[PDB]
Amino acid sequence: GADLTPCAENPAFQALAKNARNTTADPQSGQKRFERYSQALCGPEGYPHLIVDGRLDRAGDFLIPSILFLYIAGWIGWVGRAYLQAIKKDSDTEQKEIQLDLGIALPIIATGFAWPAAAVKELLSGELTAKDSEITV
Amino acid sequence: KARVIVDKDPVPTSFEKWAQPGHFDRTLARGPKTTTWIWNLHALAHDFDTHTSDLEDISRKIFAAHFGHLAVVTIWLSGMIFHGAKFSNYEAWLSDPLNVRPSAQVVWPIVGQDILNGDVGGGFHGIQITSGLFQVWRGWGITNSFQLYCTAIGGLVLAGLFLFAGWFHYHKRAPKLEWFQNVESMLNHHLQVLLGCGSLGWAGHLIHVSAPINKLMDAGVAVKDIPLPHEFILNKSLLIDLFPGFAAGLTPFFTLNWGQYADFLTFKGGLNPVTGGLWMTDIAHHHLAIAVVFIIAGHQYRTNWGIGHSIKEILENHKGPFTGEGHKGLYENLTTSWHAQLATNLAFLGSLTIIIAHHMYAMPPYPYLATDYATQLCIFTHHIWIGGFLIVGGAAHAAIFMVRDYDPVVNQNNVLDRVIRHRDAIISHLNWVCIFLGFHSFGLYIHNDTMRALGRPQDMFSDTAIQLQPVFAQWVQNLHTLAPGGTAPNALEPVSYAFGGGVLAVGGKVAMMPIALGTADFLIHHIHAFTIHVTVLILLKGVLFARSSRLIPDKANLGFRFPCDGPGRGGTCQVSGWDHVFLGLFWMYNSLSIVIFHFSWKMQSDVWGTVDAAGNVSHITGGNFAQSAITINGWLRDFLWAQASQVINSYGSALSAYGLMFLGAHFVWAFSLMFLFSGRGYWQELIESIVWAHNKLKVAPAIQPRALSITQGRAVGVAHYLLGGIATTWAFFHAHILSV
Amino acid sequence: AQAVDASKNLPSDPRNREVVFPAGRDPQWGNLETPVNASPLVKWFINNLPAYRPGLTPFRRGLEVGMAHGYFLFGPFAKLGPLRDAANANLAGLLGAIGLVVLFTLALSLYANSNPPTALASVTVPNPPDAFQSKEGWNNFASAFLIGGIGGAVVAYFLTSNLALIQ
Amino acid sequence: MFLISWRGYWQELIETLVWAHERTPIANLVRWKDKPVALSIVQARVVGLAHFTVGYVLTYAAFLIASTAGKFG
Amino acid sequence: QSSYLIKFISTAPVAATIWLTITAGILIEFNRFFPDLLFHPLP
Amino acid sequence: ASFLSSIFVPVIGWVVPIATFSFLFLYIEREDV
Amino acid sequence: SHTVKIYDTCIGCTQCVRACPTDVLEMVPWDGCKAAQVASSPRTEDCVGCKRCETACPTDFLSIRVYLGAETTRSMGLAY
Amino acid sequence: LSGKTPLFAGSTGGLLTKAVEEEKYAITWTSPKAQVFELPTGGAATMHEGENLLYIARKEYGIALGGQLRKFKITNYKIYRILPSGETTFIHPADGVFPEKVNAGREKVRFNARSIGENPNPSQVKFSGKATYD
């Protein structure tokens, strides 16, 4: 809402497309940019306003980038957790945090392509009352 | 006694110590039980005094470390000359220096940096530099890119050559201690060869290469027609036509008929009207005179032939009535502590760097420098800040010498011991001066600010109202204008037109003109002295009270760098010699940030501007400095609010990054206030609760996390506080003049 | 070699004579005897000032002190104060100067009523100064400061205002 | 000042002024009854924040009123 | 030996620097060809 | 009626501080309270 | 002025008494048959609250504590 | 108190008006050799061959000096407290043994038989004049 219209009907978007300001080395990068942003909704400024409501029509605004992060983010955290727990079994744990043991890390880094499958499998994520409880309350 | 003694194969060159971190220290070599080990690894990497109790190993590390540093500076310089060759408009600037801006960078055509590649003239789209290397290389006579290309390669070869030296010396051929302690041999060699012969050889350049090339180029001949430097040596007819003094040859030199060389060794004492800059012949006569002085000055000391002084002898003789033994024992401290040497060298080299900037603006020593107002402020502002940093370092190491290397046996009733024994009188009186000035320097601004708001403009301290004229400076100014006639009569023009004379006009721009001094200029000079005095109060107190105090008598055993003693005694917070330096940096800033504005606003208002052929000068801000620089609101209105319009409006232009850099610094600045205002006690408790969450999900780290140390928190803040401050006015200075 | 190098150790050298000494004979004490602090000229001047002069009553001291300050404080208010360019410029200085004397006398009697600890002894004045160690002495000093201060300002007003007639 | 610079630097500075006043000849007559010491650690925090807050208040007030009043919206 | 050199790269800064350079190069090189992607286009 | 401000302003700025500070100083410096 | 309290978890390191600048602490014999010694705080007027002893005691939490209280010339470390 | 003062020209840092009015201190020690030692407050001084004496403002300066004397292997450092009336008390060692080495004559004081965690809550002792640590 808020006086939000499609692009082509909006005169502001039609004017900004002329002033290209080509980003990349390609001469037609500016024209290709504005043509691609024709799909989005444009306000009085002509700048596209993205709707992150959750509409399947506007899924590319937030929904598709959103899933792309969490798959990557869980890859990073799940790899760091498994590498950290693996170090704990070895003798000198503090040194491996600094000087990484690639024999342990790189196999673990290879995994994580399916972290949710492993995550749901571990219903015991190490949580107990045996942790740092730290004066009485 | 000054013989060369060298140990052979001191240490191997194995790569295993790289894998072993913290090898240099014993405690760190054990292991990283906590995160503070990581921060301590960096804070002790260069502190060789802590690694070993052996002075010889410390000296060898230092001598080799300097060589690796010169590699960095040479690589930085070799890249500078390289960018001038490939990514630059130098060849176009040479033909049309006034109407073409200097650029040396090309941002790539990616996400949208390309707007930064603005039209700087000469068919080149790039960032407009302000270092002034275009003016430097022109004075060097570099008229083509290949001459510029070859010089870059030599620096890299020179860089690796320095790098090979530190390897050769630390691993293979280590000098012993007695080689380093020969200070008398060091001073002679550096004075005569490094400073003396280096100046003499550079005069060979000015006489053979630069001045003929410059004398041709400013005369109207194109760079295409200018011969190369080698042709002057082979063919003397071209040189004799420009400088007829060479027809006599070298015979007038040895026969003391030095008047024959007056054509190309002048004492004009002024700027060249064509190119805003000092005469090249005056710079040739310059270095030749100074080289003889340096060559002569270096034979003072003895060095194995019985002819020369012992510095120990001279110092011991300079005792007096008030100073019991005078300078007895200083030679031992200077020869037994690297920190004392670093303190003297930093303190005066920093004061030297400040003295350069004051000279370079009034008498531009390069061609086409004053017309480039962008370069002058950036060149002035840069060195002014560098010297301030180094002076503070001189006080820090002065305290480190005390806590570490001060021996009471050596310093017995000498000039130093006698200073420590009355430290209270030195500081108490300096405390009085800082309070005296701060009232009568800043209070006058408040009185003017109060009166102008009250509607009483006749009660202010101003030029029309009550006026405080700097008669002593006006007095000294008048002498230098009248000097070329009577005192030092051989000079034709006054030394600098800043003192007085006439307006010099290069193109439409004014290069330099007399800087009149009034009540407003009176009102700022003392503000520097006031801020400088407080900076000395903080730093000087750090040196004297580092060993002991009435509050703490055992401050030496704790060390130079400790946060406190404890809560009691009312509180022992920031009592160390380190913490004094931490506070002095804020005052080193406030001392310095006003200096660059006093230069920036005045020159825009009184000196820099455009001049008409009739003789009427239209300055940039139109004399607003006279009446507005006597109130704090005028600085806020006419200097900060007004001149910053180009920065905020820089978006969508080539200067748009300055608007970003002007702003990102403000974030980094306030980010400093986290670490200065806060304390570790809060942060470790917060980290404790966060550690529980990781224990819950079994993501607990092996190296147990710890908050930053107390001294580090103060350190990280002042690092941000300064970086956010300097980076802010850095972009404001750039974008203002780059538009204006 | 020059003889100046050989004589550096001898006590006959003019260098080796030391001007600075410990406060009294005890070096543990704070002060240091200096030509500014312990010279006969400075000692005579300070010890014979009204605050330290021997054989004077507390009232006589404040009168000498007040007459000086009253005569001094007239200047800043007249020439540099407001209404400095007007017929009544000198008159404003007389009132403002007497104003400080009242405030100054208030602080004196106010400091007096609060039990003053002591009057300290230093190198420049070895003996204790006077009977300024009691409320009675300080109170008489305050009343004397008021009389002299009002008189001194009037004197500076009379001379300054009637200077042209004196010329 | 009170937030950044902490006590131990200041109390040392105070000891010097105490030395001077006790050793200045004419000012030896007048002396404090209560010994002057630096502000405590918690006191300086209080004094510092009150300054940080008062300036935060008066500054925006003058901008809030004058910007709106001079233009009258 | 070679083992001593490999552990130097295994340390945190060199391991972080090499990995983080590759991460930055991938994003920089993607924005080169595919200039600007505010949203995924909609089939 | 405007003459009241000419009498009330100075006593607030001068008389009241002098009376308060003078009493408070002697009160805090008193040995027995 | 201050109050230095010594708790049961001492083991006789003798580190507290050494770190004290003003000699507020002292090691005394304990009536424990197998306990070698224990610290003490006999002259508490001279405590200057610098908390060096709290840094020296190696127990998991400190057997010795220094609770701040009424100040004086000695506790505030005023030579003047 | 009997001893020779160490030889030093003097210093601004030292005894002040507190010494006359309030409890000046004095340290005594005997030296085997005349040596240069740093003073507690600024400068250096030469101790005499035997029975040195130095007047001191605060007790902290004396014990801080004693730690320096132990570097020169002088362990017979004695401190006194001098009131304005001249009362001198053997203050630092009450008995000849040092504080570090145990002696039967001493007695424990301010000993809390409870552990530190077993201290009562302050709400239990409010409006009573009692303190938690007591």
Ligand code: CLA
């Ligand atoms: C030729 C290769 C080589 C090799 C194998 C060694 C090997 C060794 N050197 Mg050595 N050295 C060399 C060249 C070499 N050096 C050269 C060329 C110099 C002259 C500068 C020195 C000077 C030197 C000194 C003075 C010392 C050593 C020491 C050592 C030992 C420990 C070093 C260590 O673990 O830290 C490894 C550390 C690093 C790899 C980091 C170094 C970073 C470089 C030098 C600077 C980079 C600056 C950079 C531009 C800053 C950018 C900042 C910003 C972008 C973030 C080890 C046996 C030390 C020793 O023996 O200890 C007792 C010692 O004190 N060396």
Ligand code: CLA
């Ligand atoms: C010739 C110059 C010089 C030299 C050789 C030294 C040498 C030394 N200093 Mg020193 N110092 C200097 C100048 C110098 N200083 C100046 C100018 C100052 C005033 C600012 C100081 C202030 C100072 C203090 C306060 C201390 C030292 C200490 C030391 C010693 C250990 C430092 C250490 O471990 O290094 C490693 C140092 C670091 C890792 C600090 C990194 C700081 C970074 C570079 C700040 C960021 C600046 C950067 C430009 C920002 C932009 C880039 C960034 C955003 C990426 C060592 C002997 C220490 C000591 O106790 O000596 C025994 C100490 O506590 N110095």
Ligand code: CLA
């Ligand atoms: C704007 C902020 C500010 C101000 C005004 C001050 C002021 C001062 N600092 Mg300072 N300081 C600050 C920020 C500031 N600091 C910060 C942020 C830091 C941390 C880095 C420090 C760290 C610091 C140190 C480490 C030191 C100082 C010192 C000083 C003093 C220098 C003496 C002087 O200028 O004469 C006093 C001048 C003024 C106070 C200026 C304004 C006075 C006007 C003209 C008069 C007021 C009018 C009237 C009388 C008001 C009466 C009102 C009535 C109703 C009651 C002074 C009290 C030094 C010091 O105390 O030694 C002398 C010192 O060593 N400061």
Ligand code: CLA
């Ligand atoms: C600290 C800096 C400073 C200075 C130098 C002045 C100076 C002045 N102010 Mg001002 N003012 C200041 C700060 C300052 N102001 C601030 C911060 C404010 C804001 C609160 C104001 C607000 C203000 C107002 C509102 C007014 C003034 C006015 C005046 C003028 C009259 C002064 C007067 O009557 O006092 C009289 C002064 C004295 C009685 C004593 C001065 C001290 C003497 C000279 C000391 C000498 C010591 C001596 C050398 C040592 C001897 C050594 C011994 C051994 C012999 C004068 C020009 C008035 C005016 O209209 O201006 C024209 C006025 O109405 N002021």
Ligand SMILES: CC1=C(/C=C/C(C)=C/C=C/C(C)=C/C=C/C=C(C)/C=C/C=C(C)/C=C/C2=C(C)CCCC2(C)C)C(C)(C)CCC1
């Ligand atoms: C050189 C010198 C100097 C200087 C000096 C001076 C400058 C002085 C001061 C001056 C002064 C400061 C003076 C004043 C005087 C005053 C007077 C002259 C007074 C008068 C008074 C009167 C006469 C009064 C009376 C009266 C009375 C009391 C009451 C009633 C009224 C009548 C009025 C009657 C000095 C010392 C610093 C230092 C050394 C050297």
Ligand SMILES: CC1=C(C/C=C(\C)CCC[C@H](C)CCC[C@H](C)CCCC(C)C)C(=O)c2ccccc2C1=O
């Ligand atoms: C914030 C703050 C802290 C806490 C600050 C901390 C803990 C800074 C931590 C900085 C880094 C981000 C910690 C983690 C570094 C990791 C190695 C980074 C991950 C590696 C990837 C980035 C590659 C203090 O300890 C402190 C102490 C005294 C006065 C003020 C303060 C203060 O203000």
Ligand SMILES: CC1=C(C/C=C(\C)CCC[C@H](C)CCC[C@H](C)CCCC(C)C)C(=O)c2ccccc2C1=O
């Ligand atoms: C300046 C400063 C001092 C010295 C400041 C002192 C001694 C205060 C001096 C101020 C005098 C008393 C004048 C102040 C007058 C006020 C304008 C009014 C206060 C009165 C109210 C009670 C009404 C500290 O003691 C200190 C301690 C810990 C951290 C930082 C600092 C610190 O920054």
Ligand code: SF4
């Ligand atoms: S636990 Fe503490 S108090 Fe007990 S002996 Fe050890 S250091 Fe002393």
Ligand code: SF4
């Ligand atoms: S605070 Fe600690 S170290 Fe200081 S006197 Fe008291 S017990 Fe001893």
